[PDB]
């Protein structure tokens, strides 16, 4: 259960704080798990998805072992467009099919001068929680 008297267990209030969330909060909302090859390297379970990351889809019609570059993060629709997840319209032109960040796993981060700060932050607070437990 949750005991914090200031958090909202209500349904429609989380279903409203979700859809009317500002962009910078929708960046955290659109997080995505790390692959088990970068997990045992960084000690980090998920990361807010950025644009130039290589990812692989795991749930849906386009789930497979093909890896693609994230082409754009359409944070207003709560979706992303990846390199080769697409579709043909009636006439023939191709469109990118949107995938939810929770149904897709990251296989190669785009390390910036800031994604390194976020990674070392998560790693820090994770060793602090391991010493808090052990």
């Amino acid at each position: 259960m949750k005991f914090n008297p200031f958090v909202t267990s209500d349904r429609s209030k989380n279903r409203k704080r979700h859809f009317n969330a500002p962009s910078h909060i929708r960046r955290k909302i659109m997080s995505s798990p790390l692959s088990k090859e970068l997990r045992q390297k960084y000690n980090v379970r998920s990361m807010p998805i950025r644009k130039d990351d290589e990812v692989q889809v795991v749930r849906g019609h386009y789930k497979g072992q093909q890896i693609g570059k994230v082409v754009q993060v359409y944070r207003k629709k709560y979706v992303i467009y990846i390199e080769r997840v697409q579709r043909e319209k009636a006439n023939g032109t191709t469109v990118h099919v949107g995938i939810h960040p929770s149904k897709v796993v990251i296989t190669r981060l785009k390390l910036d001068k800031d994604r390194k700060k976020i990674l070392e932050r998560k790693a820090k607070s994770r060793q602090v929680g391991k010493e808090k437990g052990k």
Partner: protein, 258 residues
Amino acid sequence: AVSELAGHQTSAESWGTGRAVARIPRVRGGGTHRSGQGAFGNMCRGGRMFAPTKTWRRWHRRVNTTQKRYAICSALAASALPALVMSKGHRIEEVPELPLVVEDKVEGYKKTKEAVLLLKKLKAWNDIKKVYASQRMRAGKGKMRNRRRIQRRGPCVIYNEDNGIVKAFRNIPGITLLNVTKLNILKLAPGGHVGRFCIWTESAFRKLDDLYGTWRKAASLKSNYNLPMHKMLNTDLSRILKSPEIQRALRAPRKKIH
């Protein structure tokens, strides 16, 4: 309760007789749909409901203290009967003894793996497995009113000193905890029926007499309380009825059908 202004925020007077209209008040003039359309009364669209619910309805009930105590003693005397517990639904076919008491070191527990290992060693795990097998979405408008998920009530766990046992157990579905000094009937008898499955701890199983106490030694922790008396002692009217005392004083049965 509904608002007190609802249905009355308009201004509408009846047109009167004539006009071949049904004499209900009607909205005043205006160049809109809602113009002369029927304003108040439960019959009309919009309008006020019949006898609007108020906020001074009597919500809370008060019960006599000696009767809350009668109900607590009756909800505890019914938790030591294998039939009244196996009929509430609990899966206690392998519990070694019903008044299930455990040592005091259980209060020293701080991991939920300890509580899981205990509930398995005591063969109490088929009841949390039954809660799991009974977790499902509700039916009705209760889903959109923060009562979306429902499940079954599991065993209760009576404690005396909170050395971390509520922290240990409060993550298992169905397990609820209860201090002896504050036994709640809404928890000992969920749904209103008697016969929930309880798991005591010896330090709490040894305060029940100081709390209520036998019929000759009063309650020590309460001010003046003695266990309710019995309206009949030998409740085995089978043994009563086939006893030579009564068997001898009867006429022969007239078991022929004419």
